[PDB]
Nucleic acid binder design. Structure first.
Ligand SMILES: [Mg+2]
Ligand SMILES: [Mg+2]
Ligand SMILES: [Mg+2]
Ligand SMILES: [Mg+2]
Ligand SMILES: [Mg+2]
Ligand SMILES: [Mg+2]
Ligand SMILES: [Mg+2]
Ligand SMILES: [Mg+2]
Ligand SMILES: [Mg+2]
Ligand SMILES: [Mg+2]
Ligand SMILES: [Mg+2]
Ligand SMILES: [Mg+2]
Ligand SMILES: [Mg+2]
Ligand SMILES: [Mg+2]
Ligand SMILES: [Mg+2]
Ligand SMILES: [Mg+2]
Ligand SMILES: [Mg+2]
Ligand SMILES: [Mg+2]
Ligand SMILES: [Mg+2]
Ligand SMILES: [Mg+2]
Ligand SMILES: [Mg+2]
Ligand SMILES: [Mg+2]
Ligand SMILES: [Mg+2]
Ligand SMILES: [Mg+2]
Ligand SMILES: [Mg+2]
Ligand SMILES: [Mg+2]
Ligand SMILES: [Mg+2]
Ligand SMILES: [Mg+2]
Ligand SMILES: [Mg+2]
Ligand SMILES: [Mg+2]
Ligand SMILES: [Mg+2]
Ligand SMILES: [Mg+2]
Ligand SMILES: [Mg+2]
Ligand SMILES: [Mg+2]
Ligand SMILES: [Mg+2]
Ligand SMILES: [Mg+2]
Ligand SMILES: [Mg+2]
Ligand SMILES: [Mg+2]
Ligand SMILES: [Mg+2]
Ligand SMILES: [Mg+2]
Ligand SMILES: [Mg+2]
Ligand SMILES: [Mg+2]
Ligand SMILES: [Mg+2]
Ligand SMILES: [Mg+2]
Ligand SMILES: [Mg+2]
Ligand SMILES: [Mg+2]
Ligand SMILES: [Mg+2]
Ligand SMILES: [Mg+2]
Lengths: 75, 51, 64, 71
RNA sequence: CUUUAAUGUUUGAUGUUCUAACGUUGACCCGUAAUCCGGGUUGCGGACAGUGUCUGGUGGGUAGUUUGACUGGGGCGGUCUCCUCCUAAAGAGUAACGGAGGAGCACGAAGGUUGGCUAAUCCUGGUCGGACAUCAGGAGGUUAGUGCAAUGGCAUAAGCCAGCUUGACUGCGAGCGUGACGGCGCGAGCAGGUGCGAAAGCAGGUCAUAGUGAUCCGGUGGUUCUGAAUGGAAGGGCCAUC
RNA sequence: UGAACUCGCUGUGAAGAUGCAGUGUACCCGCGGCAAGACGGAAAGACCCCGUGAACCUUUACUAUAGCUUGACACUGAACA
RNA sequence: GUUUAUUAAAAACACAGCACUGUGCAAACACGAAAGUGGACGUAUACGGUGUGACGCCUGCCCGGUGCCGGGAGGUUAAU
RNA sequence: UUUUGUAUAAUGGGUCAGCGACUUAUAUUCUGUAGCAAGGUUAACCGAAUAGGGGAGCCGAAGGGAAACCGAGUCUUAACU
């Protein structure tokens, strides 16, 4: 048998969902490639991680010519 | 393996240093990068030297 | 007789005002060039022992 | 061999003379203790002249405010 | 300085001779009407031999021990850490000696930034030149490319060239994610001092995810932090690192 | 030798029943026989596995060490070449 | 002939004989911290060790490996 | 008793009577309870002695820092909004 190997699971995905209030610095989405994109008051880390840059509620939206899921924050 | 490690020592200052890797076979010449000395609190030419 | 202290623990811990124990972080003796600075900075300052593994520390060094 | 003398236990010896040996005689600090230091804590009434002893800036303000001059 | 002669001067492995230590399980005499032992005479070895302390080699002769786990009973075989997909039941997590694959690094340009470019694959034409090298256009449009597996990504390009550079920077770090813990990860902003751009701004390594091992022990640099009567030192410690 | 007022069957149930369910049969009690069953008695299974259990044995397993052997110093000296 | 007293009597062990090998006598070897004993009051036609196993016919090739023996210039190397 | 599970045909017990298994000392933490309270408490020991002396000491009343050192702060840091 040349099988039976697997990595430790990562704990990826969304952590803060639509409407939920978040504090500056809180991670919103922890993903691999930019499946979600940074909008208003959101940054993108070197790990392609979307995190709050201000206090307020999470807003998931879909915008742009090529149609992509943007995450934004409004206080 | 292969890629050995080196000690970039500060010219203008104390014996503070940075450690980095270096493929010695491909690149024979010495690194002479400009980096920050925090003892002097100044950017300085850090010359390469072996451990 | 008196309780002997686990001396190895006495050297690696220190009692604080509230009751907890400060300890030095691991992964900062050698093999440091490959470790990023941002780790090496956060592994420098002393850290409080977690409540999960406190009962072990309280037992093995009871006198302070 | 160093002790932390609490200001509340300062004037409990001999009028207002509390160098080291006289402080040691009243059983405020242990025997084998050469150096010692007065810190802030609570309450001075009588004037106390401390000498040949280390004193803390917050205490020095109090001890002078009571009346007694250090050294 | 090289190269060597004579003399004094200082020692060194050898060989021959000697006798006086030592040996004598050689002969004789006495303790003694005793093959022991001691003593005396005398031969034969002889500074050897042997014995002690140190010391290298050899040493199952004799000891003390060790010789893993998972396992569709055990053995044999295979696996044991890390990464990707599925299994995994549309948050996370999730087993099997379930199904397929990878890693134990690479790079001072493959990092940083500023300005500009956009692929695969066909079709037709064209010297040597052919199905395929280079050139021209047209169709196709991202079926490419991404230092290395797979996944998720990427045109604002994270893809591809060019110039100046070293932010692959020191001290931090609100607040989160993730672990039983050890730990692991993301991180806006602040202080110093940089580079890049005309400036807004960007840069705390690389598109992201693997490339790694805790403690003790000891080494190597820096710091009057300690430093046993005092002054230093050795040794510790702290910081950097193997 | 737990206590017994100690039947057969098919089925069920710790998965092969004197004891449970359903059914069939059987007056109470010996004596001589037989040995299918009571997973009969005897021996905390010897086989197999397990224990970071034990012993002995082996070896180019590790570590030592008796012995054997090498040298330096000692007991140990004098001449020369 | 001997053997598992108390489940094995044999093809097992021994055996005469054969070979190798050690041993020059204070022998080798053995028991013993040593002294000292056996070997042996024996002396290489003797003694110990190993293997083989009357007798008859024989016992081929390999010295790379492992051991053993010999050689001693060179390399390496402890204490001092 | 052991077990996922036992009427089990798994373990143990023929019966009775007697004996037979979470203790003791010293340290330590926690809860209760009593004393006294910025104080609490003595050990050995002396003692017309389970009184009373004896506070040597311990613990507490201030921490932070590897440590010098500073101290309602201090460590980190060249310095901290
Ligand atoms: Mg898994
Ligand atoms: Mg992972
Ligand atoms: Mg501490
Ligand atoms: Mg912590
Ligand atoms: Mg006292
Ligand atoms: Mg003599
Ligand atoms: Mg004799
Ligand atoms: Mg003899
Ligand atoms: Mg004699
Ligand atoms: Mg004599
Ligand atoms: Mg000799
Ligand atoms: Mg053995
Ligand atoms: Mg096993
Ligand atoms: Mg199997
Ligand atoms: Mg899922
Ligand atoms: Mg689900
Ligand atoms: Mg699995
Ligand atoms: Mg650009
Ligand atoms: Mg780039
Ligand atoms: Mg400029
Ligand atoms: Mg160890
Ligand atoms: Mg050390
Ligand atoms: Mg000194
Ligand atoms: Mg040092
Ligand atoms: Mg039945
Ligand atoms: Mg009958
Ligand atoms: Mg019968
Ligand atoms: Mg039976
Ligand atoms: Mg048993
Ligand atoms: Mg085990
Ligand atoms: Mg064993
Ligand atoms: Mg016979
Ligand atoms: Mg016999
Ligand atoms: Mg028999
Ligand atoms: Mg017979
Ligand atoms: Mg027989
Ligand atoms: Mg002899
Ligand atoms: Mg003899
Ligand atoms: Mg004899
Ligand atoms: Mg034979
Ligand atoms: Mg034969
Ligand atoms: Mg030889
Ligand atoms: Mg039942
Ligand atoms: Mg039963
Ligand atoms: Mg029954
Ligand atoms: Mg039982
Ligand atoms: Mg029974
Ligand atoms: Mg303190």
């Amino acid at each position: 048998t040349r099988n039976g190997r697997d990595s430790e699971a990562k704990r990826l995905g969304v952590k803060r969902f639509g409407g939920e209030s978040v504090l500056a610095g809180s991670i919103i989405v922890r993903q691999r490639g930019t499946k979600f994109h940074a909008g208003a008051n959101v940054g993108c880390g070197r790990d392609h991680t979307l995190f709050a840059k201000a206090d307020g509620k999470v807003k998931f939206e879909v915008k742009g010519p090529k149609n992509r899921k943007f995450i934004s924050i409004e206080a | 393996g292969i890629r050995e490690k080196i000690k970039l020592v500060s010219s203008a200052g104390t014996g503070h240093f940075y450690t980095t890797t270096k493929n010695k076979r491909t690149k024979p010449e010495k690194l002479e990068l400009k980096k920050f000395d925090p003892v002097v609190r100044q950017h300085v030419i850090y010359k390469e030297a072996k451990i | 007789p008196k309780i002997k202290t686990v001396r190895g623990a006495a050297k690696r811990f220190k009692k604080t005002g509230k009751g907890g124990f400060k300890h030095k972080h691991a992964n900062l003796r050698h093999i440091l060039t490959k470790k990023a600075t941002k780790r090496k900075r956060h592994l420098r300052p002393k850290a409080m022992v977690s409540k999960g593994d406190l009962g072990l520390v309280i037992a093995c060094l009871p006198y302070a | 061999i160093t002790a932390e003398i609490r200001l509340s236990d300062l004037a409990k010896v001999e009028g207002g003379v509390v160098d080291l040996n006289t402080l040691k005689a009243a059983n405020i600090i242990g025997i084998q203790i050469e150096f010692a230091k007065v810190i802030l804590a609570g309450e001075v009434t009588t004037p106390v002249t401390v000498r040949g002893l280390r004193v803390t800036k917050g205490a020095r303000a109090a001890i002078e405010a009571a009346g007694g001059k250090i050294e």
